[PDB]
């Protein structure tokens, strides 16, 4: 069979995650490990939320690798949950009926917009006369 691959990325902060969608059976893996062995375990459902919204039937035809770098733990989990969701939508826009892509996009964007659109917030730079961005040092009189 020919190529049916789309490399699609998800950023929430410094962190970035490039999901490599491809034709095949249903497997999802992050840096070799599967989804249900990516700690912290507290945010287990954050990785599963695209699966439990769309079912495992939509991921029957696609085997999505994810490579991740940068940021911290919670940013990386929000990067990858976004990446695989965009990666499937980009697959269904290229190789499948756009009616299917439209249905999936409407299902996700109604549950949570953060799945397809990146969070544009970045850690603000520090200014002098203060220990942080806006905080200032304690002023003394007398």
């Amino acid at each position: 069979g020919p190529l049916q691959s789309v490399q699609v990325f998800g950023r929430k902060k410094t962190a970035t995650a490039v999901a490599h969608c491809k034709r095949g059976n249903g497997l999802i893996k992050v840096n070799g490990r599967p989804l249900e062995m990516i700690e912290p375990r507290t945010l287990q459902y954050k990785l599963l939320e695209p699966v439990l919204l769309l079912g495992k039937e939509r991921f029957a035809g696609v085997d999505i690798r994810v490579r991740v770098k940068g940021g911290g733990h919670v940013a990386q989990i929000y990067a990858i949950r976004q990446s695989i969701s965009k990666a499937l939508v980009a697959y269904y826009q290229k190789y499948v009926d756009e009616a299917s892509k439209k249905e999936i996009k409407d299902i996700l964007i109604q549950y949570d917009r953060t799945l397809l659109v990146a969070d544009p917030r970045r850690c603000e730079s520090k200014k002098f006369g203060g220990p942080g961005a806006r905080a200032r040092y304690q002023k003394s009189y007398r």
Binding site: K94, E98, A99
Partner: protein, 312 residues
């Protein structure tokens, strides 16, 4: 007799600027909108929706202004405000060739009868000839329009290799394509022109602007045939493919005329009034008949394509 709506084509974010039909397929129309996507539809004419969008053709940076389908029925050519063209195979909707050369927005683009000559009129004061193998063939810069080149059009009559180009400088220029040299200037229009077309005969040409005066033009002699009173701004102009009709988008309505005896065949204006509470009605910016001339497809500026079928 009269035309009437069956339904609407709802599958755009930015509003539709151009519609393109091919003679090969009846169940395949191509709509270019003021997002960066060309929507290739599948017409079913079912009770639910007249057509569902089966392909969206991505690759453009800025608004896709123009789109036109080739003779074969495989290739489409689109022109955008980014100042480049795109050549799409309708099969997978991946771009084959991109044409680069212009500086400002490319406002329209047209094929030959052969699909071996492409022409682009732009916001930068030029027309340019294009091969189908990504080559800057010929510029025309000095003897051109003194304002933007609003539109350019090729003719079905293949015996006279001519092109008609309507500009913003209150002209219609006509160039001998093999020479690419001026044949006839056409002064007469008061103000800028939106649209120019060539009647399927290859006989008489139309011209529409803000003035609301649809002036006919001759391709045989350099003579003004006659004029119609549009009333409102004409944004779109095209003839019926089988019948001897001319259809114009007079802003928020369609006015279709019989050409021998100048009287209104009918006027088509949305009767489901949504903009009834201090809102200006959204206005039709492109229209084109089917290959048969049974159905007129008209694209609006509220992200909608409407269908107009002959009740007689």
């Amino acid at each position: 007799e009269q035309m009437t709506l069956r339904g609407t084509l709802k599958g755009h974010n930015g509003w539709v600027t151009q519609i393109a039909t091919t003679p090969q397929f009846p169940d395949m129309i191509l709509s270019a909108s003021r997002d960066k996507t060309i929507i290739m539809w599948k017409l079913t004419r079912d009770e639910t929706n007249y057509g569902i969008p089966q392909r969206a053709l991505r690759g453009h940076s800025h608004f896709v202004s123009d789109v036109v389908i080739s003779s074969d029925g495989q290739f489409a050519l689109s022109g955008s405000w980014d100042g480049t063209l795109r050549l799409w195979d309708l099969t997978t909707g991946t771009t084959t060739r991109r044409f680069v050369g212009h500086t400002k927005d490319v406002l329209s683009v047209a094929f030959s009868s052969d699909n071996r000559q492409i022409v682009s009129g732009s916001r930068d004061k030029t027309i340019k000839l294009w091969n189908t193998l990504g080559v800057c063939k010929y510029t025309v810069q000095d003897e051109s329009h003194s304002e933007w080149v609003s539109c350019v059009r090729f003719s079905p009559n293949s015996s006279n290799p001519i092109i008609v180009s309507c500009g913003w400088d209150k002209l219609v220029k006509v160039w001998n394509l093999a020479n690419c040299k001026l044949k006839t200037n056409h002064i007469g229009h008061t103000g800028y022109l939106n649209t120019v077309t060539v009647s399927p005969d290859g006989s008489l040409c139309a011209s529409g602007g803000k003035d609301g005066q649809a002036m006919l033009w001759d391709l045989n002699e350099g003579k003004h045939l006659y004029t119609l009173d549009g009333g409102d701004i004409i944004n779109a102009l095209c003839f019926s493919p089988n019948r001897y009709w001319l259809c114009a988008a007079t802003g928020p309505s369609i006015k279709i005329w019989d050409l021998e005896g100048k009287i209104i065949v009918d006027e088509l204006k949305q009767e489901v009034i949504s903009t009834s509470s201090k809102a200006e009605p959204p206005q039709c910016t492109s229209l084109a008949w089917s290959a048969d001339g049974q159905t007129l497809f008209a694209g609006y500026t509220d992200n909608l394509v409407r269908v107009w079928q002959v009740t007689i």
